[PDB]
Amino acid sequence: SGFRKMAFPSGKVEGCMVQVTCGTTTLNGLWLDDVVYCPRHVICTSEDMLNPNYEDLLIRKSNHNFLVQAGNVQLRVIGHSMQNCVLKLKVDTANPKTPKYKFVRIQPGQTFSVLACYNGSPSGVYQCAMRPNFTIKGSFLNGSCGSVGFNIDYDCVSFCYMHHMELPTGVHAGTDLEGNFYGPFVDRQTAQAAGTDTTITVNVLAWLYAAVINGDRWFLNRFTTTLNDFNLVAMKYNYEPLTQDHVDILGPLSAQTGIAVLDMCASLKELLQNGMNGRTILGSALLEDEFTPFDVVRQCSGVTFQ
Amino acid sequence: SGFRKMAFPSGKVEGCMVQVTCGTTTLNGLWLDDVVYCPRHVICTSEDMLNPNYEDLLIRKSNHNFLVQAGNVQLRVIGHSMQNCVLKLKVDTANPKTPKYKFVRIQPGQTFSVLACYNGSPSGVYQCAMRPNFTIKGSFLNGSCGSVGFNIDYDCVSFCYMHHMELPTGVHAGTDLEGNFYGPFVDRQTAQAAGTDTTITVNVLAWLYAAVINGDRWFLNRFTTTLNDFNLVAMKYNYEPLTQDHVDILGPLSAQTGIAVLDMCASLKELLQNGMNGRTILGSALLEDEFTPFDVVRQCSGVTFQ
Ligand SMILES: *C(=N)[C@H](C[C@@H]1CCNC1=O)NC(=O)[C@@H]1[C@@H]2[C@H](CN1C(=O)[C@@H](NC(=O)CC(C)(C)C)C(C)(C)C)C2(C)C
Numbered sequence: 082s083g084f085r086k087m088a089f090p091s092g093k094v095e096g097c098m099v100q101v102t103c104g105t106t107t108l109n110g111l112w113l114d115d116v117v118y119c120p121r122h123v124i125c126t127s128e129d130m131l132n133p134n135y136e137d138l139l140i141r142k143s144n145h146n147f148l149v150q151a152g153n154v155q156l157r158v159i160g161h162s163m164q165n166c167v168l169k170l171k172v173d174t175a176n177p178k179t180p181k182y183k184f185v186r187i188q189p190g191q192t193f194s195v196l197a198c199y200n201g202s203p204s205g206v207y208q209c210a211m212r213p214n215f216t217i218k219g220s221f222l223n224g225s226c227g228s229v230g231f232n233i234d235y236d237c238v239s240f241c242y243m244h245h246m247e248l249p250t251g252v253h254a255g256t257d258l259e260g261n262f263y264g265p266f267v268d269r270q271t272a273q274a275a276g277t278d279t280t281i282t283v284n285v286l287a288w289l290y291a292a293v294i295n296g297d298r299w300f301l302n303r304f305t306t307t308l309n310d311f312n313l314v315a316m317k318y319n320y321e322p323l324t325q326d327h328v329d330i331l332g333p334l335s336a337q338t339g340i341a342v343l344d345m346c347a348s349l350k351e352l353l354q355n356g357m358n359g360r361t362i363l364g365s366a367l368l369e370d371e372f373t374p375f376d377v378v379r380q381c382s383g384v385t386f387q
Numbered sequence: 388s389g390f391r392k393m394a395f396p397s398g399k400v401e402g403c404m405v406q407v408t409c410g411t412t413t414l415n416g417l418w419l420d421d422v423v424y425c426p427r428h429v430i431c432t433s434e435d436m437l438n439p440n441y442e443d444l445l446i447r448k449s450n451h452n453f454l455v456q457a458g459n460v461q462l463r464v465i466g467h468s469m470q471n472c473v474l475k476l477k478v479d480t481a482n483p484k485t486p487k488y489k490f491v492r493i494q495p496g497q498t499f500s501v502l503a504c505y506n507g508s509p510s511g512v513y514q515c516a517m518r519p520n521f522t523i524k525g526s527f528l529n530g531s532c533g534s535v536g537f538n539i540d541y542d543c544v545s546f547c548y549m550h551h552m553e554l555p556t557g558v559h560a561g562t563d564l565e566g567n568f569y570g571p572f573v574d575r576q577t578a579q580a581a582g583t584d585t586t587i588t589v590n591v592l593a594w595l596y597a598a599v600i601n602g603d604r605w606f607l608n609r610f611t612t613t614l615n616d617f618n619l620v621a622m623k624y625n626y627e628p629l630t631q632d633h634v635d636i637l638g639p640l641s642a643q644t645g646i647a648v649l650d651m652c653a654s655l656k657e658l659l660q661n662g663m664n665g666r667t668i669l670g671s672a673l674l675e676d677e678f679t680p681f682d683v684v685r686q687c688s689g690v691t692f693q
């Protein structure tokens with residue numbers, strides 16, 4: 082028992098981090114086979130970033146412009162190319178530590194693990210979710226660009242996130258590993274608003290099933306409710322609509338615990354409408370939404386990866 | 388910016404996990420050089436664990452009794468020996484992935500990272516602290532024994548924890564990597580109480596400096612106080628005494644933020660005495676104590692490891 086914000090084992094990814102240096106700029110890159118992936122604003126200079134023409138800035142540059150460092154070993158660029166917002170440097174050496182991987186583009190509500198990096202050396206790993214507004218509340222400092230988010234399935238690393246920029250409010254924006262931003266943000270240094278967020282409802286219900294699996298039960302009641310009456314209350318508390326699909330996803334969690342999904346909904350209703358009165362759920366005084374129903378199944382059962 | 392419960396990159400440790408199987412039992416082992424480390428209750432059977440004589444049970448056993456699995460590769464035991472509560476199997480092969488490491492025994496209040504494992508395959512990594520009562524609030528299921536806690540410094544893995552047992556209340560107990568339990572617990576299946584816990588005070592002050600570094604400021608005041616008057620209030624709220632040493636440790640954090648340590652103390656005082664009134668600190672509705680002053684410096688500056 083116990084429940085923790087748990088991140089995938091980061092080993093498979095650590096073997097792919099490199100330092101990428103163009104001009105006066107230095108950021109992180111992801112090295113898979115003979116290709117290194119990094120943000121395209123590695124080619125921006127300082128007085129560029131206000132409105133740069135990347136296509137144009139890149140045709141000015143040559144291969145020897147890109148200092149790629151793989152540990153203390155200088156990797157040789159033999160080609161470059163842009164793809165949406167990511168740069169791709171093709172190098173002479175293939176990375177022998179290349180795991181079986183995939184590039185996947187995730188939906189808001191999905192969680193992943195971030196390996197925060199500086200000069201291609203890992204600093205830490207932590208668990209994030211993609212917020213309904215395509216921001217993520219990460220922990221990133223200068224030089225953290227090109228750190229990646231990922232999920233691990235058996236022996237496969239699903240890459241889903243690369244880091245690019247910090248938004249005035251201190252949240253973070255980034256791209257998939259083909260270079261398409263999440264949300265409406267751009268790698269230009271003009272004003273950009275995150276957009277108002279909501280609470281990932283399906284996930285708070287998943288976390289309440291984790292609590293019940295763990296002996297916390299003070300919050301279940303006899304009351305039931307309907308999706309409609311439940312979605313009318315969520316909106317006031319600015320949660321996200323619960324679909325027929327979320328009810329379905331939460332099926333095995335309901336079956337493991339004997340609480341009908343819609344019974345757990347009327348329990349969240351009462352929580353939003355009455356607070357917590359000093360009580361806490363899984364060691365938390367807030368309603369917690371960065372756990373998927375997949376996260377709860379995996380942690381509360383014992384699924385590993387090879 | 389941003390602040391997260393951050394765990395060390397787990398790569399160096401993942402290269403050392405193996406499956407260890409004696410009799411009907413299967414648990415995790417730590418493989419460093421030609422030695423594999425695991426709990427000594429791998430040699431207990433089911434009707435033993437109520438009051439077993441380990442010294443005696445181990446002289447009954449031979450080398451071929453211990454099935455050690457290093458991936459899909461069977462490691463050959465050529466010797467065994469007990470050391471307090473840990474078993475040590477000497478094997479024919481040296482582990483070529485052995486990082487530079489150390490065995491360290493930590494004080495309560497110190498944090499570390501846990502790689503939770505099942506059948507020698509990692510399942511997740513997460514950040515724990517050693518509670519004033521030598522328990523840890525982990526996330527462990529059946530077969531998680533022999534998972535280890537660790538800190539990483541530059542290129543060195545400081546091993547500080549091995550997992551052994553879950554206490555009725557669902558907290559966890561374990562040993563250092565020489566086999567000495569933290570706290571008064573024993574690898575026998577008789578009644579054992581965790582003992583009442585307190586709040587790691589120095590750490591909540593460290594986390595309040597992390598908040599100030601990050602733009603949360605609503606909780607600082609003009610009031611100051613004395614160690615004495617501050618320690619009189621902590622005790623009511625069942626926090627731990629603040630020593631002259633904690634004030635000293637919190638020195639660079641005070642210097643980075645311009646808030647005298649004792650000024651931040653009178654700010655915690657007021658928080659304990661007035662709650663939070665719906666406000667939250669670093670995305671939290673509770674006062675958070677699983678961050679050391681070293682954790683805050685490292686996360687809020689950008690220290691990596693090689
Ligand atoms: C990644 N290497 C780097 C890290 C920043 C610093 C701290 N947190 C981070 O994520 N990202 C950047 O430097 C990006 C790139 C320049 C400037 N930049 C920033 O994130 C800016 N932020 C903005 O100005 C964001 C908006 C207004 C453009 C939306 C700061 C943090 C102020 C440097 C790129 C945006 C091209």
Ligand SMILES: *C(=N)[C@H](C[C@@H]1CCNC1=O)NC(=O)[C@@H]1[C@@H]2[C@H](CN1C(=O)[C@@H](NC(=O)CC(C)(C)C)C(C)(C)C)C2(C)C
Nearest residue numbers: 082428527528529530531532551552553574575576577579
């Ligand atoms: C590690 N492999 C294993 C994992 C447990 C199961 C779930 N969480 C865990 O940490 N640990 C054990 O099985 C230990 C070993 C037997 C029984 N055991 C337990 O932790 C017991 N708990 C107790 O009975 C603890 C007390 C009362 C002895 C203090 C359970 C979880 C009930 C199986 C050892 C204690 C030798």
